[PDB]
Write an enzyme that holds these catalytic residues in place. Structure first.
Site, PDB file in Angstrom:
ATOM      1  N   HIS B  41       8.783 -10.699  10.490  1.00 21.77           N
ATOM      2  CA  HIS B  41       7.621 -10.519  11.367  1.00 21.77           C
ATOM      3  C   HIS B  41       6.590 -11.652  11.285  1.00 21.77           C
ATOM      4  O   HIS B  41       5.599 -11.604  12.010  1.00 21.77           O
ATOM      5  CB  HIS B  41       6.942  -9.153  11.231  1.00 21.77           C
ATOM      6  CG  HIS B  41       6.261  -8.898   9.920  1.00 21.77           C
ATOM      7  ND1 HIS B  41       4.979  -9.354   9.668  1.00 21.77           N
ATOM      8  CD2 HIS B  41       6.666  -8.144   8.873  1.00 21.77           C
ATOM      9  CE1 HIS B  41       4.662  -8.902   8.462  1.00 21.77           C
ATOM     10  NE2 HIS B  41       5.646  -8.171   7.940  1.00 21.77           N
ATOM     11  N   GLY B 143      -2.098  -9.649   4.431  1.00 19.04           N
ATOM     12  CA  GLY B 143      -1.818 -10.968   3.859  1.00 19.04           C
ATOM     13  C   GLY B 143      -0.878 -10.902   2.659  1.00 19.04           C
ATOM     14  O   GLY B 143      -0.403 -11.937   2.175  1.00 19.04           O
ATOM     15  N   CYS B 145       2.116  -9.451   2.703  1.00 20.75           N
ATOM     16  CA  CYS B 145       3.519  -9.424   3.134  1.00 20.75           C
ATOM     17  C   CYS B 145       4.301 -10.590   2.570  1.00 20.75           C
ATOM     18  O   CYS B 145       3.761 -11.688   2.452  1.00 20.75           O
ATOM     19  CB  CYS B 145       3.617  -9.369   4.648  1.00 20.75           C
ATOM     20  SG  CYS B 145       2.862  -7.891   5.360  1.00 20.75           S
TER      21      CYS B 145
HETATM   22  O1  LIG Z   1       1.503  -2.970   7.863  1.00 21.50           O
HETATM   23  C1  LIG Z   1       1.228  -4.135   8.073  1.00 21.50           C
HETATM   24  N1  LIG Z   1       0.618  -4.984   7.199  1.00 21.50           N
HETATM   25  C2  LIG Z   1       0.071  -4.608   5.929  1.00 21.50           C
HETATM   26  C3  LIG Z   1       0.812  -4.672   4.753  1.00 21.50           C
HETATM   27  N2  LIG Z   1       0.376  -4.294   3.540  1.00 21.50           N
HETATM   28  C4  LIG Z   1      -0.865  -3.829   3.455  1.00 21.50           C
HETATM   29  C5  LIG Z   1      -1.745  -3.706   4.558  1.00 21.50           C
HETATM   30  C6  LIG Z   1      -3.067  -3.204   4.442  1.00 21.50           C
HETATM   31  C7  LIG Z   1      -3.869  -3.095   5.542  1.00 21.50           C
HETATM   32  C8  LIG Z   1      -3.403  -3.470   6.799  1.00 21.50           C
HETATM   33  C9  LIG Z   1      -2.137  -3.962   6.955  1.00 21.50           C
HETATM   34  C10 LIG Z   1      -1.263  -4.102   5.841  1.00 21.50           C
HETATM   35  C11 LIG Z   1       0.531  -6.363   7.709  1.00 21.50           C
HETATM   36  C12 LIG Z   1       1.444  -6.352   8.933  1.00 21.50           C
HETATM   37  C13 LIG Z   1       1.432  -4.885   9.404  1.00 21.50           C
HETATM   38  O2  LIG Z   1       0.270  -4.633  10.189  1.00 21.50           O
HETATM   39  C14 LIG Z   1       2.716  -4.453  10.116  1.00 21.50           C
HETATM   40  C15 LIG Z   1       2.678  -3.653  11.258  1.00 21.50           C
HETATM   41  C16 LIG Z   1       3.849  -3.160  11.821  1.00 21.50           C
HETATM   42  C17 LIG Z   1       5.077  -3.461  11.250  1.00 21.50           C
HETATM   43  C18 LIG Z   1       5.109  -4.284  10.138  1.00 21.50           C
HETATM   44 CL1  LIG Z   1       6.643  -4.666   9.408  1.00 21.50          CL
HETATM   45  C19 LIG Z   1       3.951  -4.790   9.571  1.00 21.50           C
END
Ligand SMILES: O=C1N(c2cncc3ccccc23)CC[C@@]1(O)c1cccc(Cl)c1
Ligand SMILES: O=C1N(c2cncc3ccccc23)CC[C@@]1(O)c1cccc(Cl)c1
Ligand SMILES: [Cl-]
Ligand SMILES: [Cl-]
Ligand SMILES: [Cl-]
Lengths: 299, 305
Positions: B41, B143, B145
């Site tokens: 992603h 951030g 990820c």
């Molecule tokens: O869950 C997600 N992230 C996040 C990852 N970890 C902690 C977070 C804390 C707070 C906000 C987001 C966090 C970053 C990318 C994200 O918005 C997303 C959305 C849909 C699918 C996927 Cl695979 C990833």
């Protein structure tokens, strides 16, 4: 989201861990520049000056990985032995030796035979002990914090007390607590809860969406301390109130407003509820640890 | 003595963390030999996340669209391929700090250390378990990820997890290092939720054996149970079923303490019924389920107190 007991990344400290052997005793040493620091009890009612004068440089075996370092000098500073070696550690990070106060937290890199086995976070208790996880052979393992790119070494492990808790020194060999490095009757004093840390953790719970414990009430510093003294909690000072200022501004809950919540938790308990997955009030996160984990500071 | 939630030393993994940037998105990558592994992603925008066609988004990218930074050094991307939900970026420099490593897929109940990172820079290390509902209860901000989970039994790092997303309840979902998600999750912003979670029974039993090794027996009783009666009771408290495999795995701890697995099961049944009555076990007022039988043997003394 989430809130974990988090340690600093240990890599900068791992590159300093060595094995020190003197006769039959083997323990861990910290190799910084051309000096290996380790507990003086590696040599043996002890008279450490008398035991040390009978040793030569070649009696100390220092192993860094699969390489033998040659000891070219030795001296004692308080309860730490300093072994001068011919090779400066090429992996020596930027560092300082700092003495911490009770309530402060630090990461511990537990080692056996100069090899790191694990890393955990802990706090210097008000009774100067640490509730660590150490077995025989862990002596010389160190505690540290990282500020930017600088490792601040604050603890070196020396012994386990009869209650299973641990005692050690700063890197200048001064003990934390009224302890001595000899086999004699010693005991941890009555411990107390680190109040400013519990408040910081309650602010971490509010930031993460746990608000059930909040109430409309506030209190005074003096009334809070009268209640806190009854439950073996450390007194809360104006310095502690000041330090909690940023967390008070982020959540909109005044420090004495959070104290009123804490007083209610002490007098009534949790009533089957938890805060951040815990049924006990957690006191091993400082206000700075809460700010750092809820902001993502890197090293 | 003592019992702490202990993580593996993170140094071997710190030397692999890099920053990956594609357009406006920045996240973390794992640099092993001449390949950087990261969540696919990184090629998406916020809008793309509802129904992204990753094959269509990736075909529009060239090697020079991926910026990889290792410390203060830019690595050159010379190839790219997608494997499930992971993007593999071939670079022109092999990581000189690459440790001995393996990619392992873990099962629910297994524990691992997480090195949380932001902008390719490690911020902290903590211990985690793969929950029975395939999520992890982590501490991750936006951030993070690309941050990874691992174990380091001996000198070899076994990478088992890469962080991809946070679910609405605040729990986390991700993949193994081959890009296969743990659980029924997808790397889409579609309505997804963690299933009902349960307690890892074999881990609670392991932790009760750790308490016995460290000198505490207050919770033991004179009773035993059949495996089936234990499971009928356990399911009522949302505890995972205990299998014959779990009983077998607890064999060594049973032999060290002299307490049969089914006698420890009777003790667990009673604790569930009565609570702790103001007492603690290894400094905890709740039954701990994020230590495996293997973790208990690794941390505890071989001589019971
Ligand atoms: O869950 C997600 N992230 C996040 C990852 N970890 C902690 C977070 C804390 C707070 C906000 C987001 C966090 C970053 C990318 C994200 O918005 C997303 C959305 C849909 C699918 C996927 Cl695979 C990833
Ligand atoms: O407390 C001690 N050690 C130990 C240190 N840590 C954990 C242990 C677990 C179990 C047994 C011992 C442990 C090792 C040396 C020790 O016996 C000792 C004795 C007298 C003085 C001093 Cl400074 C140190
Ligand atoms: Cl309480
Ligand atoms: Cl591979
Ligand atoms: Cl597994």
């Amino acid at each position: 989201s989430g809130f974990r007991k988090m340690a600093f990344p240990s890599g900068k400290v791992e590159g300093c861990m060595v094995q020190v052997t003197c006769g039959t005793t083997t323990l861990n040493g910290l190799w910084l520049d051309d000096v290996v620091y380790c507990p003086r009890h590696v040599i043996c009612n002890p008279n450490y000056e008398d035991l040390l004068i009978r040793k030569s440089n070649h009696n100390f075996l220092v192993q860094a990985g699969n390489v033998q370092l040659r000891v070219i000098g030795h001296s004692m500073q308080n309860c730490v032995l300093k072994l001068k070696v011919d090779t400066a550690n090429p992996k020596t990070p930027k560092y300082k030796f700092v003495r911490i106060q009770p309530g402060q937290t630090f990461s511990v890199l537990a080692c056996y035979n100069g090899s790191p086995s694990g890393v955990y976070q802990c706090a210097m208790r008000p009774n100067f002990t640490i509730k660590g996880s150490f077995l025989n052979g862990s002596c010389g393992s160190v505690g540290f914090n990282i500020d930017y790119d600088c490792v601040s070494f604050c603890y070196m492990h020396h012994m386990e007390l009869p209650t299973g808790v641990h005692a050690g020194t700063d890197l200048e060999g001064n003990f934390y607590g009224p302890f001595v490095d000899r086999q004699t009757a010693q005991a941890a004093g009555t411990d107390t809860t680190i109040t400013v840390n519990v408040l910081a953790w309650l602010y971490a719970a509010v930031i993460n969406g746990d608000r059930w414990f909040l109430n409309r009430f506030t209190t005074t510093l003096n009334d809070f301390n009268l209640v806190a003294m009854k439950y073996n909690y450390e007194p809360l000072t104006q310095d502690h109130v000041d330090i909690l200022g940023p967390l008070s501004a982020q959540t909109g809950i005044a420090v004495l407003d959070m104290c009123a919540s804490l007083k209610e938790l002490l007098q009534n308990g949790m009533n089957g509820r938890t805060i951040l997955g815990s049924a006990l009030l957690e006191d091993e996160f400082t206000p700075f640890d809460v700010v750092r984990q809820c902001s993502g500071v890197t090293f």
